[PDB]
Amino acid sequence: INIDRRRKDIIRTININPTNITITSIKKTEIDGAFEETETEIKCVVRIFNEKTAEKQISSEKQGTFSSIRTYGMLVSNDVILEVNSRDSLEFECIYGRMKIVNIYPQIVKGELCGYQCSLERID
Amino acid sequence: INIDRRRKDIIRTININPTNITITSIKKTEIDGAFEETETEIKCVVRIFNEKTAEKQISSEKQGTFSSIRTYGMLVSNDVILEVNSRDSLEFECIYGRMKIVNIYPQIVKGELCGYQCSLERID
Amino acid sequence: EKLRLLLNDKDKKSFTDEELNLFLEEADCIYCAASQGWILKSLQYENTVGEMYEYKVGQETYKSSSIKDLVSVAYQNADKFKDMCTNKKEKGSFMLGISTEFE
Amino acid sequence: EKLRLLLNDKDKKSFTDEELNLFLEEADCIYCAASQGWILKSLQYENTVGEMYEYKVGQETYKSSSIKDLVSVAYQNADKFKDMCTNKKEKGSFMLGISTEFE
Amino acid sequence: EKLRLLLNDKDKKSFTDEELNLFLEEADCIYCAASQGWILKSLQYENTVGEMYEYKVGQETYKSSSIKDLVSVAYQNADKFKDMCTNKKEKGSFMLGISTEFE
Amino acid sequence: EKLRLLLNDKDKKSFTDEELNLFLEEADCIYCAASQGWILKSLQYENTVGEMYEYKVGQETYKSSSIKDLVSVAYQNADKFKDMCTNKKEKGSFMLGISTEFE
Amino acid sequence: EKLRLLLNDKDKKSFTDEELNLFLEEADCIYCAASQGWILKSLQYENTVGEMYEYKVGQETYKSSSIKDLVSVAYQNADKFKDMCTNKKEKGSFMLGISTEFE
Amino acid sequence: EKLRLLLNDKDKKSFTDEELNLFLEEADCIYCAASQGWILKSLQYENTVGEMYEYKVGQETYKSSSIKDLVSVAYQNADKFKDMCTNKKEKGSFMLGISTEFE
Amino acid sequence: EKLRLLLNDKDKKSFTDEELNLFLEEADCIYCAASQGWILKSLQYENTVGEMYEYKVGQETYKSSSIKDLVSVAYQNADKFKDMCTNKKEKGSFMLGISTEFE
Amino acid sequence: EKLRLLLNDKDKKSFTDEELNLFLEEADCIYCAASQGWILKSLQYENTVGEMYEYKVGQETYKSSSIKDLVSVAYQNADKFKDMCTNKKEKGSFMLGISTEFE
């Protein structure tokens, strides 16, 4: 497979049903054995799609209540480098509850990045 | 895929076997660190179908007893905007036990809503 | 009665009786009118089955014969009615005398 | 009884017994009326069986014969009865004398 | 009314009357205009249905008839109407007298 | 208007205005221009359906008719328009007198 | 302009203009040059789309038109342009007088 | 330049220039040389696609057209170039005078 | 060099140059030797590729071209070179004078 | 050496030299011997591939071309060798004089 084929396919698939998304990144930085969080905001064009037939979990407790579902995937181009770790997070404001990028699958051809297959978690 | 194609397909599929449904929405509003619940009632045309071969769970305890099953899905048009969260609920009474909308899948084409795929829980 | 017989031939309650009278006026023989009505009835499969002929939702699955098969069946009905009309109006071969005047 | 034999040629209550009289009247040969009635019965499959030849609901799955197949079989039956009518009415070849008056 | 009959031969509201009258004026025989309109309506399946004949989203699955099938059926309808026009206008064979003056 | 009739004979806003005038200039009969424009439109399918005609992402699946079927449909449209033009200009057979001068 | 019409016929932005000028110089008939350019564009599908007609990575699945279909369609377009060139240049039959001098 | 035009015809960057010169030497007409180069290119598909034309690893799946398909396409290119050369060197039929000396 | 051109005609690194000299000596026409070498190279696919055209181990899955397809393509190449040998050595028709001595 | 040439015309490692000498002495032309040896080699596939040609154990899957395809390929080799022998011994048509004694 050639890089141009993958690039054209990713861009086309995103452009069938794109949505403009405002990713917000909170990166934790180790300072004196604790975290100092620097918040940055980055925008990208994105297509969102179902990937898993999952069920909405609920986690009510004395801290609070929130329900999250794992169904939605995501597919974004090469325009911005992404990364999600324990110390790094990415979220964005979809209208139907806030989305959160759980795991990133970087699509690479011959050691060259071309786009991120990605997974989400719709936090209600 | 064109928006009109999706709209025609959803409306046709609902009209093969529609049921008039009286959705009741109880939305929890944060007031002085507690919930004040406002109850509204909204009606929509709906088709109900099986989606998962699941088993009826039972949850008897000193609080009480109730049995629920996740088999039934749901498919509704664009006529009314829906939303289900931890603080927001939607229910309706099919004659065979009360139904409850667990999770909402909004079918969107080019950033435009056209209908909600949905999942239910038949609370006996 | 011609209208009731045609409504028997051309499958009932898809055309209002006005166009049934129109077809009866158009063709003297009822079977020609039946073929006409069947060809005209075959057009509805466009809307009915052309835009959707097999769909699955959840575990619910429903398949129907494609538009091509249904229009083929309707065309076969039309051709049978037309051939029936022709055979009704058909007459066998003939040998007849011939004579020219002469002085 | 002619009506009973015809209602044997077509399985009972796809037609009211009255119009069997019409079918008998339109053709004295019973097999011709049987072929006509079989075509008319073939027209009825769009209501009795419809296009939805296969469907699955829950754990139920049913695969009925497609309408094209049923109408094809009905047409084949009608053709068989028509051929029976012809063979019953058909007569073999003939060689006959010919003669013209002369003085 | 010729326009109403043409809107029955060719299904409603895919065109507007401003071209139905044009098709009626194009050929005096209504069936020829019906064939022309059926071809022109067959052209419209590029938009009304599109090539995306099957898709699955979530648990929804829909299988529409492919555009090739729809245009084929529309062409078949147009051909049927054209053949109807010809048969309406067709006249059988003829044997006629011939004569040349001589002195 | 010839341009409006041609844009009725083809999809209305895929082509720019000047090339419609170009096609009208190239062939006087509108149907020949329609056939030419339909072939030229058929050339487009390499861009859209050629490089991708069937894709699935996640549970989202979409299928479209292959490039071969769509270009076949467009070619069928072109051939129908060409045959329409020929039948427009076609004229039947002729028997005419012949005469050579002599003294 | 010759070049603009050719870039319309032979689809744009695959060749630079100098070889298009060469194409026009090869044959005065634009459609013959279009057929030649369509063949030479057909040769280029091995690079632009490659033989890898289908692949799945992660949850992405893409099925492109196979190279055989694309080259076949390009060849069909070239054949159509060649036939257009011939028909434009073709003249019908002829009957002409003949005469030889004698004495 | 002949070598540039041949590298345009025979797809570029697979044969180094000395065998291209050999091709140009083997035949004057460039299209015959292009057909020869296309066949010799088609020979290469052994290594590329005979060893493997469809493989899946993990969730990664890749499909490519079989060696038979690609060599068929290359043979089609070769035959088109050969026919192009023949048509270039072809000339129409001829009627010529004949005369033998006599006393 | 004849040997280098033959190795281009029949790929390198499989056979040692001794049999290449043998093929060159057995036929002066290089394409005839190429056809012979292509058949003899087709014989070698039973070892280089073998019968095991597809296998899956672990998550690996590889589908190689079947031996029948490979030998078929090699035979087709040999046939092409043989036809080339014929056409190079072929000569058109001839009409020649004939004469016998007489007193 | 004739034995080495035959063992080049055949795949070797499955025929001891005694039967190679047997084939060499049975048929003088080496290609006839090659065809015979190839048929005899084709006989062996009943053991290797006839008994088992596609098996899966665990996740391990292995497919090989069926006995019919392999024996077909071997038969094709045999027929090619036989035709090669015929063309070797083939000689063109002849016109010769004829003369009978007379007084």
Side-chain angles (χ1 to χ4, degrees):
Chain A
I1 177 159
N2 307 334
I3 183 56
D4 282 29
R5 171 62 181 288
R6 194 93 187 73
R7 200 163 304 292
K8 284 176 184 289
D9 282 328
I10 287 153
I11 287 155
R12 194 194 322 101
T13 313
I14 289 152
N15 289 354
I16 302 313
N17 191 9
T19 74
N20 292 113
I21 294 302
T22 61
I23 303 297
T24 187
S25 75
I26 289 159
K27 287 187 284 192
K28 287 163 172 65
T29 73
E30 192 275 331
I31 293 295
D32 296 358
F35 290 140
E36 185 180 1
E37 305 189 321
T38 61
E39 190 193 327
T40 79
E41 192 151 19
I42 60 183
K43 299 179 186 291
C44 289
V45 308
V46 163
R47 169 156 184 197
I48 288 152
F49 57 94
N50 308 324
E51 67 170 7
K52 284 175 73 173
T53 306
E55 50 275 23
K56 176 144 76 76
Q57 293 89 22
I58 297 162
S59 174
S60 190
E61 53 171 42
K62 69 185 170 61
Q63 165 162 225
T65 307
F66 85 104
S67 74
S68 73
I69 194 170
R70 179 59 184 78
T71 300
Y72 297 102
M74 197 187 86
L75 171 50
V76 64
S77 73
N78 189 30
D79 59 349
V80 174
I81 188 167
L82 298 180
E83 183 173 5
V84 173
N85 309 324
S86 50
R87 288 167 154 172
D88 301 329
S89 69
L90 301 169
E91 309 165 74
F92 58 96
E93 275 277 5
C94 188
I95 301 96
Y96 321 96
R98 307 179 71 269
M99 301 286 175
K100 180 164 190 296
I101 292 162
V102 168
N103 175 56
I104 288 290
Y105 286 123
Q107 314 302 270
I108 290 158
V109 181
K110 292 195 165 54
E112 192 168 359
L113 175 62
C114 193
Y116 299 106
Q117 276 192 60
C118 165
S119 66
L120 302 186
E121 178 174 1
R122 187 256 290 287
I123 287 152
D124 288 319
Chain B
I1 179 160
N2 306 336
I3 182 56
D4 282 30
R5 172 62 182 288
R6 194 93 188 74
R7 200 163 304 292
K8 285 176 186 288
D9 282 328
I10 287 153
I11 286 155
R12 194 194 321 101
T13 313
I14 289 152
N15 289 353
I16 301 311
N17 190 7
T19 74
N20 292 111
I21 294 302
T22 60
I23 302 298
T24 187
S25 75
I26 290 159
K27 287 187 284 192
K28 287 163 172 64
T29 74
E30 192 276 332
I31 293 294
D32 296 358
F35 291 141
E36 185 179 1
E37 305 189 322
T38 62
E39 190 192 327
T40 79
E41 192 151 18
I42 60 182
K43 300 178 186 291
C44 290
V45 307
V46 164
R47 170 156 183 198
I48 288 153
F49 57 95
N50 308 325
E51 65 170 6
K52 286 173 72 173
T53 307
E55 306 84 35
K56 174 145 78 77
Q57 295 88 22
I58 297 162
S59 174
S60 190
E61 53 172 42
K62 69 185 170 61
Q63 166 162 225
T65 307
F66 84 104
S67 73
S68 73
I69 194 170
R70 265 284 298 99
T71 300
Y72 297 100
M74 196 187 82
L75 172 50
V76 64
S77 74
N78 189 30
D79 60 349
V80 174
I81 188 167
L82 298 180
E83 182 173 5
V84 173
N85 310 324
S86 50
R87 289 167 154 173
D88 301 328
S89 70
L90 302 169
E91 308 169 73
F92 62 97
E93 52 283 23
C94 182
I95 298 97
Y96 301 96
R98 186 183 299 286
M99 301 285 176
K100 180 164 190 296
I101 292 162
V102 168
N103 175 56
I104 288 292
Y105 286 122
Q107 314 302 270
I108 290 159
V109 182
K110 292 195 165 54
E112 192 168 359
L113 175 62
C114 193
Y116 299 106
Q117 276 193 61
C118 165
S119 46
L120 302 185
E121 181 173 2
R122 187 256 291 287
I123 287 152
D124 287 319
Chain C
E1 180 50 47
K2 59 189 188 306
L3 191 143
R4 281 81 174 167
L5 176 52
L6 189 62
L7 275 178
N8 185 28
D9 299 334
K10 192 261 176 185
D11 203 358
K12 214 167 65 167
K13 316 309 301 187
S14 173
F15 283 170
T16 181
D17 285 16
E18 164 52 19
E19 53 260 18
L20 274 290
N21 294 115
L22 184 139
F23 307 143
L24 286 153
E25 297 142 25
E26 201 76 41
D28 55 357
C29 191
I30 193 161
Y31 299 137
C32 182
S35 168
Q36 195 68 265
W38 267 99
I39 295 165
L40 294 163
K41 158 167 163 66
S42 68
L43 313 183
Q44 296 174 347
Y45 297 138
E46 175 187 51
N47 308 313
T48 302
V49 179
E51 63 178 44
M52 190 278 291
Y53 75 96
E54 151 165 20
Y55 80 98
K56 167 176 180 180
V57 294
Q59 324 196 50
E60 311 279 28
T61 304
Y62 300 93
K63 307 187 190 169
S64 65
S65 296
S66 54
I67 186 169
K68 204 173 185 185
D69 278 18
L70 303 177
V71 71
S72 159
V73 167
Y75 273 44
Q76 205 188 359
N77 288 316
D79 301 323
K80 270 288 183 186
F81 277 116
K82 201 157 181 62
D83 294 20
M84 198 169 284
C85 180
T86 56
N87 299 336
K88 178 161 279 189
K89 90 177 64 49
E90 185 269 330
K91 314 295 143 192
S93 297
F94 281 91
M95 157 159 77
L96 314 173
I98 182 161
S99 64
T100 188
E101 66 277 20
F102 199 85
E103 194 273 339
Chain D
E1 174 46 54
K2 46 177 165 52
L3 189 143
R4 180 56 54 75
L5 179 54
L6 192 55
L7 280 179
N8 188 57
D9 292 343
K10 306 189 283 158
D11 287 285
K12 272 61 61 168
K13 299 294 184 184
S14 48
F15 293 81
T16 179
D17 300 345
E18 200 278 343
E19 59 203 352
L20 277 288
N21 299 261
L22 180 135
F23 303 140
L24 290 151
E25 287 167 355
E26 291 302 323
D28 58 353
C29 188
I30 193 161
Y31 302 135
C32 202
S35 169
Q36 177 73 333
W38 255 110
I39 291 162
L40 293 167
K41 191 166 153 69
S42 77
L43 312 186
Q44 294 187 350
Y45 291 133
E46 283 181 67
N47 296 119
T48 62
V49 170
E51 320 96 323
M52 196 151 286
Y53 70 95
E54 183 174 56
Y55 71 99
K56 170 179 171 182
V57 299
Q59 319 204 41
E60 306 266 33
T61 307
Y62 297 111
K63 200 185 191 177
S64 69
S65 307
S66 60
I67 189 163
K68 197 179 181 186
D69 201 293
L70 291 169
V71 67
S72 178
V73 170
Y75 277 35
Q76 206 183 351
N77 295 332
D79 174 77
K80 272 284 180 188
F81 283 120
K82 178 50 56 168
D83 296 17
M84 201 163 285
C85 174
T86 56
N87 302 337
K88 186 64 65 167
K89 294 282 182 213
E90 182 268 333
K91 270 83 76 175
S93 299
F94 284 91
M95 156 163 78
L96 314 172
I98 181 161
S99 64
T100 187
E101 69 279 15
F102 198 85
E103 199 273 357
Chain E
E1 174 45 53
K2 57 188 165 189
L3 183 134
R4 178 56 55 73
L5 175 55
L6 186 58
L7 283 177
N8 182 39
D9 292 353
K10 181 175 65 55
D11 196 359
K12 272 78 74 173
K13 290 173 180 290
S14 182
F15 296 161
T16 178
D17 298 0
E18 292 182 342
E19 53 263 19
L20 274 287
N21 56 8
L22 178 135
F23 304 140
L24 287 154
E25 292 174 350
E26 277 277 274
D28 72 314
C29 191
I30 193 168
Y31 300 105
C32 182
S35 170
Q36 182 75 338
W38 255 109
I39 292 162
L40 294 169
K41 179 171 156 71
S42 78
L43 308 185
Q44 295 184 318
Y45 296 138
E46 291 291 329
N47 299 119
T48 59
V49 170
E51 58 266 31
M52 193 151 286
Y53 72 97
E54 173 165 50
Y55 69 99
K56 179 185 169 183
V57 299
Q59 319 205 41
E60 306 265 34
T61 302
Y62 297 112
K63 198 186 190 186
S64 70
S65 308
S66 58
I67 188 160
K68 198 180 181 186
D69 190 3
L70 295 173
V71 67
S72 178
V73 170
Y75 276 36
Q76 207 183 351
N77 295 334
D79 179 75
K80 273 284 181 187
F81 285 121
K82 203 160 65 177
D83 295 18
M84 197 167 282
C85 175
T86 55
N87 302 337
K88 184 60 60 171
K89 297 290 186 182
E90 185 269 331
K91 273 79 71 175
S93 299
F94 283 91
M95 155 164 78
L96 314 172
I98 182 161
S99 63
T100 187
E101 68 278 15
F102 198 84
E103 313 306 323
Chain F
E1 182 52 49
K2 62 191 189 288
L3 191 144
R4 281 55 169 277
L5 181 54
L6 182 53
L7 286 178
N8 186 43
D9 290 358
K10 203 159 53 54
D11 284 7
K12 202 161 62 174
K13 190 59 67 175
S14 184
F15 282 23
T16 188
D17 302 356
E18 55 263 61
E19 62 192 1
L20 272 293
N21 300 111
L22 188 146
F23 307 143
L24 288 151
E25 289 164 327
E26 280 184 322
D28 301 340
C29 188
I30 192 162
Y31 299 135
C32 182
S35 168
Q36 181 72 327
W38 261 103
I39 294 162
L40 291 166
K41 165 164 162 64
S42 80
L43 307 186
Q44 292 185 353
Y45 296 136
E46 59 166 343
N47 299 345
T48 64
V49 178
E51 62 177 43
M52 189 276 288
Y53 75 95
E54 181 177 0
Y55 80 98
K56 168 178 180 183
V57 294
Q59 323 196 50
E60 310 277 28
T61 305
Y62 299 90
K63 309 189 187 170
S64 62
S65 289
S66 62
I67 191 176
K68 204 173 185 186
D69 291 332
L70 305 188
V71 71
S72 158
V73 167
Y75 273 44
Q76 204 187 358
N77 289 320
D79 303 318
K80 269 287 183 186
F81 274 117
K82 181 155 277 290
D83 297 17
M84 199 168 284
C85 176
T86 57
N87 302 335
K88 187 66 66 175
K89 64 171 78 67
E90 184 269 331
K91 304 291 169 182
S93 297
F94 282 90
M95 158 159 77
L96 314 174
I98 182 160
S99 64
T100 189
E101 64 275 20
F102 203 85
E103 281 65 18
Chain G
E1 175 49 59
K2 308 168 197 171
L3 193 141
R4 181 56 50 72
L5 174 52
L6 192 59
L7 284 176
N8 184 43
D9 297 325
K10 185 267 189 195
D11 206 1
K12 205 166 68 174
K13 192 57 65 176
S14 172
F15 288 178
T16 177
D17 273 21
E18 54 262 49
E19 52 258 13
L20 272 288
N21 296 319
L22 188 153
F23 275 114
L24 290 154
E25 290 168 354
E26 279 188 65
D28 72 328
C29 188
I30 192 161
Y31 301 134
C32 202
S35 170
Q36 191 82 338
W38 257 109
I39 292 163
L40 277 154
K41 195 175 153 75
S42 77
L43 311 185
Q44 295 197 330
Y45 290 132
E46 277 186 272
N47 296 118
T48 61
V49 290
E51 66 278 2
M52 190 155 286
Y53 74 96
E54 175 166 47
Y55 69 97
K56 178 185 170 183
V57 299
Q59 319 205 39
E60 305 266 34
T61 302
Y62 297 112
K63 199 184 190 188
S64 70
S65 312
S66 81
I67 191 163
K68 208 191 187 177
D69 300 317
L70 286 162
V71 68
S72 178
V73 168
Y75 276 35
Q76 206 182 352
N77 297 331
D79 171 76
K80 274 283 180 187
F81 282 115
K82 185 178 271 283
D83 294 19
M84 202 162 286
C85 171
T86 55
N87 301 339
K88 183 60 62 169
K89 294 281 142 160
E90 180 268 331
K91 309 312 306 163
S93 300
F94 282 91
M95 155 163 78
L96 313 171
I98 182 161
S99 64
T100 187
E101 70 281 14
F102 193 86
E103 210 270 316
Chain H
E1 175 48 51
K2 272 204 179 179
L3 194 147
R4 307 274 102 73
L5 176 54
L6 188 62
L7 278 177
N8 179 25
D9 301 333
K10 192 266 185 191
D11 204 356
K12 212 168 65 173
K13 302 295 103 176
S14 176
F15 287 179
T16 177
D17 280 21
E18 57 267 24
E19 54 257 14
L20 272 289
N21 291 311
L22 188 149
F23 282 119
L24 289 154
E25 293 151 13
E26 276 271 285
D28 169 38
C29 187
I30 193 162
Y31 299 135
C32 199
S35 168
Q36 190 75 329
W38 259 108
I39 295 162
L40 280 150
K41 194 175 155 75
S42 80
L43 304 188
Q44 291 181 323
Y45 292 135
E46 294 178 287
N47 315 136
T48 305
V49 186
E51 295 190 357
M52 182 277 296
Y53 76 95
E54 177 174 1
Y55 84 103
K56 172 178 182 188
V57 295
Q59 324 196 50
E60 311 278 28
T61 305
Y62 303 90
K63 312 195 190 174
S64 61
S65 295
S66 62
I67 187 165
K68 200 176 186 186
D69 202 321
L70 305 188
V71 72
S72 158
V73 169
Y75 273 43
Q76 205 188 359
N77 290 322
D79 301 325
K80 269 287 186 186
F81 276 115
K82 182 160 276 289
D83 294 20
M84 198 167 285
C85 173
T86 56
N87 299 337
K88 186 66 68 174
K89 80 210 290 189
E90 181 268 334
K91 296 289 173 287
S93 297
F94 282 90
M95 157 160 78
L96 314 174
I98 182 161
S99 64
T100 188
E101 66 277 19
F102 199 84
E103 187 273 333
Chain I
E1 173 45 55
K2 49 176 157 50
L3 188 143
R4 181 59 57 75
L5 177 55
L6 186 55
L7 283 175
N8 186 53
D9 289 350
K10 181 266 289 180
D11 300 60
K12 201 162 63 171
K13 309 180 183 177
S14 176
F15 288 10
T16 182
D17 293 352
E18 198 279 330
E19 49 262 24
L20 275 291
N21 298 267
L22 189 148
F23 304 144
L24 289 154
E25 293 295 323
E26 288 300 318
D28 58 353
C29 189
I30 192 161
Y31 302 135
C32 203
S35 171
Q36 185 76 338
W38 256 106
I39 291 162
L40 293 168
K41 182 167 151 70
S42 78
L43 306 187
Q44 313 313 323
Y45 292 138
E46 285 178 349
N47 294 353
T48 62
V49 171
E51 321 97 317
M52 195 150 286
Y53 73 96
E54 184 175 31
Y55 69 97
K56 170 180 173 183
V57 299
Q59 319 204 41
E60 306 266 33
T61 300
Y62 299 109
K63 200 185 191 185
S64 71
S65 306
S66 82
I67 189 168
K68 199 178 180 186
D69 299 318
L70 289 172
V71 66
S72 178
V73 169
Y75 276 36
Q76 206 182 351
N77 296 331
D79 174 77
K80 273 284 180 187
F81 285 122
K82 178 50 56 169
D83 296 17
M84 206 158 283
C85 175
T86 56
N87 302 337
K88 187 64 63 166
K89 299 269 148 179
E90 186 267 332
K91 315 292 147 61
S93 299
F94 283 90
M95 155 164 79
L96 314 173
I98 182 161
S99 64
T100 186
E101 69 279 14
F102 198 85
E103 198 274 356
Chain J
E1 178 49 51
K2 61 189 188 296
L3 192 143
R4 310 310 303 181
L5 182 55
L6 182 54
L7 282 180
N8 185 31
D9 290 6
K10 202 146 62 69
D11 203 75
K12 205 162 55 181
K13 276 78 72 175
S14 75
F15 296 74
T16 181
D17 307 324
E18 167 50 25
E19 52 260 17
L20 272 293
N21 297 114
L22 187 144
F23 308 145
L24 285 153
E25 64 206 287
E26 275 183 347
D28 300 339
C29 188
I30 192 161
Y31 298 150
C32 182
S35 169
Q36 181 72 326
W38 264 102
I39 293 162
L40 290 167
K41 175 167 161 66
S42 81
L43 304 183
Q44 299 186 328
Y45 294 138
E46 56 159 348
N47 310 145
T48 306
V49 179
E51 205 177 72
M52 185 277 294
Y53 77 96
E54 153 165 14
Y55 79 98
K56 169 178 179 180
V57 294
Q59 323 195 50
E60 311 277 29
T61 305
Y62 299 94
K63 307 187 189 168
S64 64
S65 292
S66 59
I67 191 180
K68 204 173 185 186
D69 276 28
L70 304 179
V71 72
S72 159
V73 167
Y75 272 45
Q76 205 188 359
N77 289 322
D79 302 322
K80 270 287 183 186
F81 274 116
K82 206 165 181 64
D83 297 17
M84 200 170 285
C85 177
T86 56
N87 301 334
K88 181 67 71 169
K89 66 169 78 67
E90 186 269 329
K91 303 180 191 172
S93 298
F94 281 90
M95 157 160 78
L96 314 173
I98 183 161
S99 64
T100 188
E101 65 275 20
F102 203 83
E103 305 87 332

